[PDB]
Design an enzyme around this catalytic site. Structure first.
Site, short mmCIF file in Angstrom:
data_model
loop_
_atom_site.label_atom_id
_atom_site.label_comp_id
_atom_site.label_asym_id
_atom_site.label_seq_id
_atom_site.Cartn_x
_atom_site.Cartn_y
_atom_site.Cartn_z
N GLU A 35 0.87 -1.28 0.06
CA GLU A 35 -0.08 -0.06 -0.01
C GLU A 35 0.69 1.27 -0.03
O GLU A 35 0.76 2.18 -0.53
CB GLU A 35 -0.75 0.05 0.99
CG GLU A 35 -1.93 -0.97 1.10
CD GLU A 35 -3.37 -0.52 0.20
OE1 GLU A 35 -3.08 0.30 -0.60
OE2 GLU A 35 -4.42 -1.11 0.22
N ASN A 46 -8.14 8.65 -5.46
CA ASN A 46 -8.92 7.74 -6.19
C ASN A 46 -9.78 8.37 -7.24
O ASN A 46 -10.00 9.65 -7.25
CB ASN A 46 -9.77 7.11 -5.28
CG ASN A 46 -9.24 6.30 -4.06
OD1 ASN A 46 -8.29 6.44 -3.60
ND2 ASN A 46 -9.69 4.96 -4.43
N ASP A 48 -12.77 8.40 -7.93
CA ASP A 48 -14.32 9.05 -7.20
C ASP A 48 -13.90 10.21 -6.36
O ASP A 48 -14.87 10.86 -6.21
CB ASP A 48 -14.85 7.83 -6.30
CG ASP A 48 -14.18 7.83 -5.07
OD1 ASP A 48 -13.05 7.82 -4.89
OD2 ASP A 48 -14.96 7.43 -4.07
N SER A 50 -12.01 10.80 -3.70
CA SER A 50 -11.37 10.45 -2.45
C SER A 50 -10.19 10.43 -2.64
O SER A 50 -9.62 10.04 -3.50
CB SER A 50 -12.43 9.27 -1.77
OG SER A 50 -11.90 8.05 -2.41
N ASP A 52 -6.54 8.16 -0.46
CA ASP A 52 -5.99 7.10 0.39
C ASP A 52 -4.77 7.86 1.20
O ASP A 52 -3.89 8.53 0.43
CB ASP A 52 -5.50 5.80 -0.29
CG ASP A 52 -6.82 5.39 -0.94
OD1 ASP A 52 -7.79 5.19 -0.66
OD2 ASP A 52 -6.24 4.70 -1.93
N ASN A 59 -8.86 5.63 3.43
CA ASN A 59 -9.70 6.31 2.44
C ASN A 59 -10.46 7.35 3.08
O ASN A 59 -11.00 7.12 4.22
CB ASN A 59 -10.36 5.40 1.59
CG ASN A 59 -11.14 5.93 0.59
OD1 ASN A 59 -12.29 6.35 0.80
ND2 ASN A 59 -10.65 6.45 -0.58
N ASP A 101 -15.38 -3.71 9.84
CA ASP A 101 -16.47 -3.39 8.89
C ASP A 101 -17.47 -4.36 8.20
O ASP A 101 -18.48 -4.12 7.63
CB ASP A 101 -16.01 -2.26 7.96
CG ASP A 101 -17.11 -1.54 7.21
OD1 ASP A 101 -17.96 -0.92 8.07
OD2 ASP A 101 -17.42 -1.88 5.96
NA NA Z 1 -3.05 1.16 -2.98
#
Ligand code: NA
EC number: 3.2.1.17
Length: 129
Positions: A35, A46, A48, A50, A52, A59, A101
């Protein structure tokens, strides 16, 4: 800050990630490598809109506030900037919420695609834990 491999493993272990929701420590180190390359300052935008943040690329659509993700939530109740600190406390505590979640670590697409089902114990080999 860019963590050493065992340096990160140690910090994650101290913050209670080893077998959190049943995911052994090597899962979390693996996820962090792919990551963020162990870099707390990693960010990714991202499609959309958003973003990270941080060592586990958490996110803004659900988990933190950056003030620029319309209609989003801040379920970890933190500014996203907190996820970039050299201290990983905020990332770990937020990750604990994410992984609870419903979908476990599948919440991290990189974990599902590159760590899931592999020999993740190798990520803590050599570490004094
Ligand atoms: Na990633």
């Amino acid at each position: 800050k860019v963590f050493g491999r065992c340096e990160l493993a140690a910090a994650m272990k101290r913050h209670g990630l080893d077998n959190y929701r049943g995911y052994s420590l090597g899962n979390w180190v693996c996820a962090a490598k792919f990551e963020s390359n162990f870099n707390t300052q990693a960010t990714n935008r991202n499609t959309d809109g958003s973003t990270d943040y941080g060592i586990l690329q958490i996110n803004s659509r659900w988990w933190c506030n950056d003030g620029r993700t319309p209609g989003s939530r801040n379920l970890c109740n933190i500014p996203c900037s907190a996820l970039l600190s050299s201290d990983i406390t905020a990332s770990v505590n937020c990750a604990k919420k994410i992984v609870s979640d419903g979908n476990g670590m599948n919440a991290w697409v990189a974990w599902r695609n590159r760590c899931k089902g592999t020999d993740v114990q190798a990520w803590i080999r050599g570490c004094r834990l």
